Amino acid sequence: GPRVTVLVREFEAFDNAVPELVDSFLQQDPAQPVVVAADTLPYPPLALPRIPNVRLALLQPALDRPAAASRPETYVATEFVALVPDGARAEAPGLLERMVEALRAGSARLVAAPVATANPARCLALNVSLREWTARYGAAPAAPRCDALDGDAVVLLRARDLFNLSAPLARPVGTSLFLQTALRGWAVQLLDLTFAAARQPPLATAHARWKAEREGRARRAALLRALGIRLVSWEGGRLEWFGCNKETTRCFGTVVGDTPAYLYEERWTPPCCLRALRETARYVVGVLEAAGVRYWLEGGSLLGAARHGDIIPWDYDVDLGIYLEDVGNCEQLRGAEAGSVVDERGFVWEKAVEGDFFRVQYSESNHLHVDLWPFYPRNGVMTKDTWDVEFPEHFLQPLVPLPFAGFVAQAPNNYRRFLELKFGPGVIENPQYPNPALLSLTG
Amino acid sequence: PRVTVLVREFEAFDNAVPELVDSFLQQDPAQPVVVAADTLPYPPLALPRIPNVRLALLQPALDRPAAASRPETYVATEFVALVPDGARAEAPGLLERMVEALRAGSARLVAAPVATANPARCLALNVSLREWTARYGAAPAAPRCDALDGDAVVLLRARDLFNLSAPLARPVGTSLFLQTALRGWAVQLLDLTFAAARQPPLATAHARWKAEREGRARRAALLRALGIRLVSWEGGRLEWFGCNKETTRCFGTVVGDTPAYLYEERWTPPCCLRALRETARYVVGVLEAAGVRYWLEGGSLLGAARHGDIIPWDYDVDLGIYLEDVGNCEQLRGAEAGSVVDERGFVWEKAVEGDFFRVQYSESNHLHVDLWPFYPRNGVMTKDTWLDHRQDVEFPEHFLQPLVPLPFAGFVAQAPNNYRRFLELKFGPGVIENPQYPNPALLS
Amino acid sequence: PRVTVLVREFEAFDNAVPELVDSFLQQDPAQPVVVAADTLPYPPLALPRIPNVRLALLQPALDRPAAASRPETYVATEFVALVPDGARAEAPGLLERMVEALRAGSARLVAAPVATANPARCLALNVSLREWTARYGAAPAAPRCDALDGDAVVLLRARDLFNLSAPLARPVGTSLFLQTALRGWAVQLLDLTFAAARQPPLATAHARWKAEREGRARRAALLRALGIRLVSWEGGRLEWFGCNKETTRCFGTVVGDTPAYLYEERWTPPCCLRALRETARYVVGVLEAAGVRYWLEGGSLLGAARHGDIIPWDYDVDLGIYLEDVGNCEQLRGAEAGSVVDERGFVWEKAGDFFRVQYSESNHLHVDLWPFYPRNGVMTKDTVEFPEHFLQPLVPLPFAGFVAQAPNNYRRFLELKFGPGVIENPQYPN
Amino acid sequence: PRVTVLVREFEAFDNAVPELVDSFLQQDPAQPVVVAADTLPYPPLALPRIPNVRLALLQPALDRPAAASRPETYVATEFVALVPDGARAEAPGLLERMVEALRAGSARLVAAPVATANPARCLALNVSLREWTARYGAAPAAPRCDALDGDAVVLLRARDLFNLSAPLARPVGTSLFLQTALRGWAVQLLDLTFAAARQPPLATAHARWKAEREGRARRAALLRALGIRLVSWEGGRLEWFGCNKETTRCFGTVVGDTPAYLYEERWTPPCCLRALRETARYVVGVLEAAGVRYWLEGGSLLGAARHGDIIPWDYDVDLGIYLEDVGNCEQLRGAEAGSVVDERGFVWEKAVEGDFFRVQYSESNHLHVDLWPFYPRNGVMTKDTWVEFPEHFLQPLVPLPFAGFVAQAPNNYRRFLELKFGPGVIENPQYPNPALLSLTG
Ligand SMILES: *[C@@H]1O[C@H](CO)[C@@H](O)[C@H](O)[C@H]1NC(C)=O
Ligand SMILES: *[C@@H]1O[C@H](CO)[C@@H](O)[C@H](O)[C@H]1NC(C)=O
Ligand SMILES: *[C@@H]1O[C@H](CO)[C@@H](O)[C@H](O)[C@H]1NC(C)=O
Ligand SMILES: *[C@@H]1O[C@H](CO)[C@@H](O)[C@H](O)[C@H]1NC(C)=O
Ligand SMILES: *[C@@H]1O[C@H](CO)[C@@H](O)[C@H](O)[C@H]1NC(C)=O
Ligand SMILES: *[C@@H]1O[C@H](CO)[C@@H](O)[C@H](O)[C@H]1NC(C)=O
Ligand SMILES: *[C@@H]1O[C@H](CO)[C@@H](O)[C@H](O)[C@H]1NC(C)=O
Ligand SMILES: [Ba+2]
Ligand SMILES: [Ba+2]
Ligand SMILES: [Ba+2]
Ligand SMILES: [Ba+2]
Ligand SMILES: [Ba+2]
Ligand SMILES: [Zn+2]
Ligand SMILES: [Zn+2]
Ligand SMILES: [Zn+2]
Ligand SMILES: [Zn+2]
Structure with missing residues (x-):
């Protein structure tokens, strides 16, 4: 039985390659568990296969659902979760297995594989200081061991680690996840594996990229304010402010x-x-x-x-x-x-x-x-x-x-x-x- | 019978939560109390920092586990009583009598009004998500209702409250009965009354005014998030939200x-x-x-x-x-x-x-x-x-x-x-x- | 049927408390768990920092209120189960079964042995404050007992446990039944069994000898503080504490x-x-x-x-x-x-x-x-x-x-x- | 009656607690009085057998309920007056004077020295838990103080005293002000004096020697238990406890x-x-x-x-x-x-x-x-x-x-x-x- 649940959180409803993503993983193992998570039902419809191992997880309160329905661990029965960004595709068989093997044998609580897009994942260093409301990023001195990733990567970790964070799936996952894992002292290991790109990549035109990036920067801005990150820096400089x-x-x-x-x-x-x-x-x-x-x-x-x-x-x-x-x-x-x-x-x-x-x-x-x-x-x-x-x-x-x-x-x-x-x-x-x-004690 | 007092409806800028909590502590020093808020209230609430009184912050945080913002993990008792700001425990054993009535009755929720200028009243409630509407009216089988309007302590089992999708969404007075009535659950309005606060909150007209506005904004956000576009009352009066x-x-x-x-x-x-x-x-x-x-x-x-x-x-x-x-x-x-x-x-x-x-x-x-x-x-x-x-x-x-x-x-x-x-x-x-x-x- | 697990008997230098707590959390992720200690255990217990698991430090402190060392203030539930280090929850539903036996029966305490090397056995117990003496023997009415010797989960109502004068005084297996036997309370040794920790504590001979020696010291200080100068056993064995x-x-x-x-x-x-x-x-x-x-x-x-x-x-x-x-x-x-x-x-x-x-x-x-x-x-x-x-x-x-x-x-x-x-x-x- | 006299600092083998209790009863037969001890004091104190005088035994006992060892159980008034052995009530209307001062000022404690050989002096005190240090000194803002050295009646609200973690730990003269100064509370040393007992306790060199050996042993155990590794006076006269x-x-x-x-x-x-x-x-x-x-x-x-x-x-x-x-x-x-x-x-x-x-x-x-x-x-x-x-x-x-x-x-x-x-x-x-x-471990 499969030991990894693919989880898709980063995609845009108006322009995505999520149906191709899901179909590519089902073509190596038709029983492969796949979860697509979203705050509201994506429209236009995704029309994913109506099979029990493919599920839409809607992370929103609703008057007619139990508390469990809005909790992402409800949707995962396996030991491991692979966060897969839109624009990835599974072509080489057994890549999720190699990632599991690398995780268990290594000493990093996360492992990752870049997606061969126009922006493959780069290994980064990240110091989070809640007292100074600051996230300091930099080049990773001990690559391929990192604190954070920039760009597109399949990230694999144990479900019990992911779903025990406060904001496991807050968007953009590329920012929120490594803020939480780096603060905890966890590392991410950039493996020498590569997932292929979608054959019809999403956001192919400049106008679609423009809309996608405008919304994502808005999600990031609101995420950093909610989480108490007032200043982001790269190599001590290029200050980005949120206060x-x-x-x-x-x-x-x-x-x-x-x-x-x-x-x-x-x-x-x-x-x-x-x-x-x-x-x-x-x-x-x-x-x-x-x-x-x-x-x-x-x-x-x-x-x-x-x-x-x-x-x-x-x-x-x-x-x-x-x-x-x-x-x-x-x-x-x-x-x-x-x-x-x-x-x-x-x-x-x-x-x-x-x-x-x-x-x-x-x-x-x-x-x-x-x-x-x-x-x-x-x-x-x-x-x-x-x-x-x-x-x-x-x-x-x-x-x-x-x-x-x-x-x-x-x-x-x-x-x-x-x-x-x-x-x-x-x-x-x-x-x-x-x-x-x-x-x-003293007010 | 063990009951956790849970306080959700209050304003950071002007509230009587310290008095509320002290009034229950005077009846039982070890009384479990959970104050829930979205962010750390400032000015400080200055609750007694004793282990049976806890502050549950429902916000995500970089240095907290998922459980720290799930309120059920702060409630260990079988029953929970939602208590609004402006209320106080004066008579001994009120919560125990409410437990007795819930065990004896058939309704899944019981409630006691609070003796404020606006005590809770029994109301009927039909929810239709398909039509995006919630329809209120006079209770045909009072003191058994689908919903309440006004201030009440509401007691129900922890398991029932925290299996709702949004147990503590504000205003609780609106949010809670929308979810319970949709499930066919009833709230039995008991003949017990909690006292009001000695120094009630929102004592000035300006403070009252900025509270009613923030509440209206929260209520509108609530109905939009839950998909209620239209609220009707008997008397035919309509409130829109679309x-x-x-x-x-x-x-x-x-x-x-x-x-x-x-x-x-x-x-x-x-x-x-x-x-x-x-x-x-x-x-x-x-x-x-x-x-x-x-x-x-x-x-x-x-x-x-x-x-x-x-x-x-x-x-x-x-x-x-x-x-x-x-x-x-x-x-x-x-x-x-x-x-x-x-x-x-x-x-x-x-x-x-x-x-x-x-x-x-x-x-x-x-x-x-x-x-x-x-x-x-x-x-x-x-x-x-x-x-x-x-x-x-x-x-x-x-x-x-x-x-x-x-x-x-x-x-x-x-x-x-x-x-x-x-x-x-x-x-x-x-x-x-x-x-x-x-x-x-x-x-x- | 809400029960708080309460852990009091463990050694900071060598314990299986993390496994104990985790095993109950697998059966219920919101299970209330209170680990009680006189001072902060070091090396760190590293319990899960989730609201339903709490560490209660029982000694006084310059920067804490009276309430912070009073354990009832950490327990909100109707029932408490004292669990010794070395025990783990495997089958689900063991605490509710113990709750049911308690409500069904006439004993104010019920207990389930832990499958350790020393599972709890029943004992008679007679306490004479006037003569500063506690007398143990074989229990005639077993499975109904005055006291227990060995490892067991003990469940009672929290109002019963915390109205005692010294509910968590160590060792619990001595101090608790001294207080309950003096009040005429009985413990029913149920037929349930808790499993042992999969990695038990005190595995080496040096570790176990270090634990036995500090335990004897705690037992002796306890009996002196409560006025027991003599523990006598059926068969003649005498233990002096004066x-x-x-x-x-x-x-x-x-x-x-x-x-x-x-x-x-x-x-x-x-x-x-x-x-x-x-x-x-x-x-x-x-x-x-x-x-x-x-x-x-x-x-x-x-x-x-x-x-x-x-x-x-x-x-x-x-x-x-x-x-x-x-x-x-x-x-x-x-x-x-x-x-x-x-x-x-x-x-x-x-x-x-x-x-x-x-x-x-x-x-x-x-x-x-x-x-x-x-x-x-x-x-x-x-x-x-x-x-x-x-x-x-x-x-x-x-x-x-x-x-x-x-x-x-x-x-x-x-x-x-x-x-x-x-x-x-x-x-x-x- | 709004003040309960609480006596905690005395020695069983030699004290003037009967004279103390009597003195307060001579001015009000209904005065609430509580003598607090870890164990039954021997020789017997022989205090009057009336409902308003009570002996509180704070140690846990096999035959007693939890409440018996909780000192707030014995007090039913709004205020508590901590009275050291050696003191005596002679001028009527003294505790009510201390309550009036307490209400009208800003300090949560008020104190009146007793006229012994060691009457209370006003001190500064900072407690740093991180450095495990208690730094004493001469009080800049006297008669507003952080701590007292010597004999005084100390009056404060019951709710404040019994909310502390160790409200009656001995010596009180050390333990109380460590807790109140850490909280930022002040004590106000009033211009009121309690008389001394007519037959003072510990009058011989040998009795004083025994009491001081015992008190020093209690204080050293108190400081280790509370994590005070170092006591200093004006940054010098170092006293170590680690x-x-x-x-x-x-x-x-x-x-x-x-x-x-x-x-x-x-x-x-x-x-x-x-x-x-x-x-x-x-x-x-x-x-x-x-x-x-x-x-x-x-x-x-x-x-x-x-x-x-x-x-x-x-x-x-x-x-x-x-x-x-x-x-x-x-x-x-x-x-x-x-x-x-x-x-x-x-x-x-x-x-x-x-x-x-x-x-x-x-x-x-x-x-x-x-x-x-x-x-x-x-x-x-x-x-x-x-x-x-x-x-x-x-x-x-x-x-x-x-x-x-x-x-x-x-x-x-x-x-x-x-x-x-x-x-x-x-x-x-x-x-x-x-x-x-x-978070990390
Ligand atoms: C992060 O912190 C370490 C240790 O304090 C420091 O050596 C490193 O330069 C920091 N990196 C960044 C990118 O700030
Ligand atoms: C007791 O002290 C604590 C300080 O830790 C404070 O939070 C609480 O309000 C105090 N209670 C009273 C009744 O003074
Ligand atoms: C609620 O629905 C019931 C069921 O048909 C109906 O009898 C009643 O009139 C409705 N009440 C309101 C206020 O809409
Ligand atoms: C969940 O997070 C906390 C860290 O805040 C940790 O103590 C606990 O062990 C975690 N649980 C799991 C199963 O990892
Ligand atoms: C305790 O009391 C009974 C008599 O009331 C006596 O027969 C019994 O032996 C005593 N228990 C022990 C252990 O001796
Ligand atoms: C002692 O028992 C009484 C009655 O059951 C109860 O009111 C009180 O809370 C108990 N004390 C505790 C639990 O500390
Ligand atoms: C205590 O601290 C205050 C200011 O922090 C300082 O001015 C005062 O000198 C200190 N006193 C002692 C005796 O250390
Ligand atoms: Ba048409
Ligand atoms: Ba048309
Ligand atoms: Ba003789
Ligand atoms: Ba300044
Ligand atoms: Ba070094
Ligand atoms: Zn700013
Ligand atoms: Zn519309
Ligand atoms: Zn002897
Ligand atoms: Zn040292």
Whole structure:
């Protein structure tokens, strides 16, 4: 009895070669189990053979079906599942068997065989970091052992592994599967086997490709947002973003009890939010330097600068100190005492509700901000008559350059002494990343 | 008797879940409680972090197994009680009495109203997926109902709830009884009342307002996902959830003369049918006012002869008109120059394929009436271009002299005389008495 | 028919808990499973991280609420099945069959042996808190039993298990039936059989010996915490869990002639009585070797007359001796200079009219020797008296495992000292 | 009546609990009073036989229901006042004063010192479970505190006290504030004083000696059970409660390579780090005096470059050495022939596994410094078992602070570290990830 169930999930209803795919596997073994899975009944009809080992699995809730009907493991009775993309065909007999033999003999929980299309599967490296909401892809250093595949491959793994993931069949499978398996530390072995292409390949015209790719990028975008992947990178670069921006709200919205929503989700600050914070800091610093406002990294920004030259990865704002006596040198600041001011580049400058400090928002919609805390000497010690620690004014005589958030910012001289006076001894050396369990106990 | 309290209906921005859960914990410190949500609620729910109170997140996640989003794996007890936000346990032993009534009764669900401004009421409910409709009315055999409207604790066996396809789809008040009534199950409305929340949620008019809107949006999403286009109540009042003048038609381009919904074992959506009847009514009024001779044709005449309406799986309307009359109608005259949007938003155009005219419900909604021009050759009605149908044939002009009245789509339409013989000539003997799909070589 | 599997008996260093849990999950993927432990097991159990399988850590923690160590809070179902490591579910439906037998029967617990090397056998069990003793034997009414010895799945209602004072105290097979036998509950040893793990734990000789040694340590700590100083078996085997030659005695300094165990509504710990009997026998032996005239006195004579033993709530032994003979005994001559620790560890002291022999330097259970002298034909000390004819002659009287010497006509002698009817009217503590 | 007096800190052999109970009853005969003990106190306390005075025995017993050992079972008021032995109620209207203060302020605990020789002082306290440390200090915001030192009545809500995991674990003065400070709760030390008992307990040197021996034993057992390996005062006066030269290391055999402490969502116990630092310093001392070229390697060099210490979740130290130098060191030459215990108890052995050397802290405590011999071939440092690196990184070695002393590091160690670990590794620590560990294994 067959030990592998072919499963087809990646195809387009308007233009596919799924009937040829199914027919090709049935022509090596008429009893071969084949499952085609879809969110709704594909139209135009697929007209697959009406035989018991071929089944359409409709992954949608329906008023007249049991819970089992929308669960893909219901449709698989074999030990192994072979995910087969549309556009493949089985011509050499026994390829699924060789893949089973390779899986059992190897040490990778997945094995794959490229399909000989215009885009055969390439072996990739992938690091998934849920805390940084990032998926980092790269060339696979230990090919043919990989974390992920790009392109067309028959992928074979045990049904109990596949159907135990949270989103076994979320689309595109080429993205969702390896996000889940790579996070788990599993590997995929690119075998030296090749499945043939369909004789009449799907999506043969430019217009059909255009529709297919438009829908698939839309599925991918929605998939990465639902799964909490805000940034995709290739070799550290070619950033592809899925978070907040100048024209949207910031990811975590309004903060309740100075504990942003992302900490309860056991993650750190989204990288789109950190990116806007860096850009807003660079911009405010550039403006203050050109206007003649003396400023220095303050608080957690200074602490992040001194520790690793960037925003601390679970922080969500930037704090700078300024000489109160110099506020008038800056137009945006001058206007900020009157009322909120939207400058020429969309940055919003406000005088705070209470507490006498200035706030610069990334944009009118995206409320990530830099806070400016004005101080004035009172006989050698900086003070704000509203309350951020009081400190001696010689720490600013003079100020020091310090790498921060991708540029050079000004800091208090001997910032190490400055940091422990405000935070306590040894602060630079002992970071404490968020503690969700502790947070769960203490609200 | 062990019962898990399961909380699904609440709002993250404004709720009384902490009070709800504490009220059951005051009665039994080890009381199992499951709060279910699609995403982690923020601001934090701050439930007691004790092992018998769990939060079930129904979203997929990269670092969780499939079971973590299946709520049955959080319920170990035989029974489960769905409790809405705004409710509280005050009297001891309420859930136990509900268990007793379920074991003693015959209904598969029992329910207790909550003493909010809107306690649950007993309702009747018929679901027809084929017609995309759910029909509510007054309960004939109260306190035994098919569905409830309003706030109630609903107790049923875990095995029964979690074998539904969408046990926790929101609103539960709508979703649950749609699934239970379809299965012939009854909910027995008990004479027990749960108390309301001391600090009820949604205390301000603004908070209430943004809740009713988010609920309506969820309810509409629910009915679209489940294929309910039309909801009716006794009193005759209707809520729609499909087509209108401003949207697309529900089903899209038809291949093989068999629309997508037939493969889904459903008939034409009632909203598409409504648009087709209103377009047929309008077009007939225009042609009559213009002096264009028209007759019901094809499947429209067939439907007319059978039951005075569109065939319930059909998706367009067909009229024959005299060719020499097209010049009488302003929209028709324009349609030969190009597509014409007229005074009521109907779109008239000469079709790609067969030198016939098409009238679309709107620019976005392409439900249409097709007008087929005919001219008499020698007492024989005919045209130059033919579509590849067994229904597209010549026929004797005497069938059009004279035309007879015939109810169709809510109005009186003109039909060929002896339309039975007419229909049998075009479709074959007995067509009126033998309904069949537009092509049974594919689907019958 | 919803049953939570509850695993408590396993060793972190060597266990088959992953197989056990997986076997029940094959029969039902949503089977509730609770694995209970005092601390987080390492190496990791690596249980499935699915909502119906949970690890309950029972010790206190700075960062957890009270509820987190209370096991009932992890069990929502009506029934619980305690499953020992080494067992696996093969046939489906075994727990529901056990539930049915439970509802059908009259035993508050039912049990099914596991086909290990040591499948559960039935036992009788009698618990006497007053005497700090648990007594096991062969069970007359098997398959209905007070306790079990060996591997079994035990099923009971969760309200029954978790109202016990120490439901999951280890070892479970000792602690559970101690608590249920004391309440009059019975266990029915059903005829069902759970299979053994396909890869059993403790496969090597070193592993098994390491497990037996830590188990004996847990068993000993359990019996000490619950007040079982002695486990006795039908056939004579005795297991001691109290004081001995190298420890302190169990109760320490008595105030107001009422030892601590009386206020706990218990009698003398049996290990303390055993030490007293052995000191009495040793002292009598030394006295008889040195030719010292001794007789039973006070409560020891009373207990000898009543039942040939120490009164079970007494805590010392009193002997009278002829003062003229004190010199014939080395230990007692030495006792006048100072404390004497002899060959065998006994501590002889004079303190005070009288001498006192302690079982050992650490264990101060003692025999008091009170010397008398004949002056009037009456026996008298110098800091109550009785006529000398009660000692001429002395009679043999069983006491504490040996033949002691007692005044002649000692019943008459006991009612001179204590009043009439004393032998038949024991002054029971209340 | 809204406050239940709860007495937990006393000694059976010598106490003033009868005077205490009486004093509260003299001011209100109906006062709820609970004396809590693990076992029946002997000699008998002889407390009044009235319904509002109860003796709670918290140990499990064969004849008692579960509830009997749960302290909330004995309390039916909203508040609990923890009262130490030695205190006495004289001024009426004192507990109601503490309730009024509690309600009107923000602290969930309020306290009043008792006028003994050791009246309560206000302290700061941070608890770090990851570092297994309790850091005490003088309270910056007195009389708002994190913890108390000395005798005080402590009043808080019953629901708060009996929700803690170990609400009456002894000593209370230690156990309570470890739990409340971890939760971020404060205690407010009021300007109210409870009088002392007229006949104070433990008045003799001998009675005090016994009580202090017992209390210290209870506290050491309490700290081990709760995972506090290290107590400090103002960062000094260190008190240790973990492993040492004469014991096992805290976590024993690593099977991951994921030590047990990561599964407990903590870092390396600080006693283990202390042993590792001292072994690294001793080994380095031996290598320098014997003339062995060594350098910090792997995560030791990485930790030195990041913050000059062992990475706080790492559990060993790695050093490279020149293989041609091994002969210069007696311990190493002995290690090739068999395991050698040297004059100070360190164990030098040659793991035949990976062809390196390993120095253990002691025969029992297997925290170790690993020594990786390299040899050059064409100016590339290499070895025969396992990355290799160019020798110029060792020509010359540079000083680098590490673990309390100055150690040798490759020159350009940032470039050295980046080649081995990747760019940015110094700036982006791989912080322990409980959630992920729970997923991968
Ligand atoms: C993934 O992580 C490893 C180890 O942290 C690192 O060496 C590698 O360069 C990373 N790969 C990518 C593509 O980010
Ligand atoms: C008990 O403590 C936990 C913190 O782990 C908290 O979640 C819960 O709300 C507390 N309950 C009460 C009644 O304070
Ligand atoms: C529901 O269907 C039943 C069965 O024919 C019918 O008697 C009843 O009138 C229907 N009720 C509603 C509200 O449509
Ligand atoms: C399902 O996934 C979880 C990981 O989150 C794992 O613990 C469990 O063992 C998996 N079950 C199977 C059958 O692989
Ligand atoms: C327990 O009690 C009965 C009498 O009530 C006694 O006959 C039986 O022997 C005792 N059990 C054992 C094991 O001795
Ligand atoms: C003890 O038994 C009673 C009655 O069955 C029940 O109310 C209570 O929950 C039980 N205690 C537990 C299960 O801890
Ligand atoms: C506790 O932490 C705070 C800030 O984290 C620090 O300022 C205070 O100095 C610390 N106190 C002690 C005694 O470590
Ligand atoms: Ba900050
Ligand atoms: Ba038609
Ligand atoms: Ba038509
Ligand atoms: Ba006596
Ligand atoms: Ba390392
Ligand atoms: Zn963002
Ligand atoms: Zn429609
Ligand atoms: Zn004893
Ligand atoms: Zn240690």
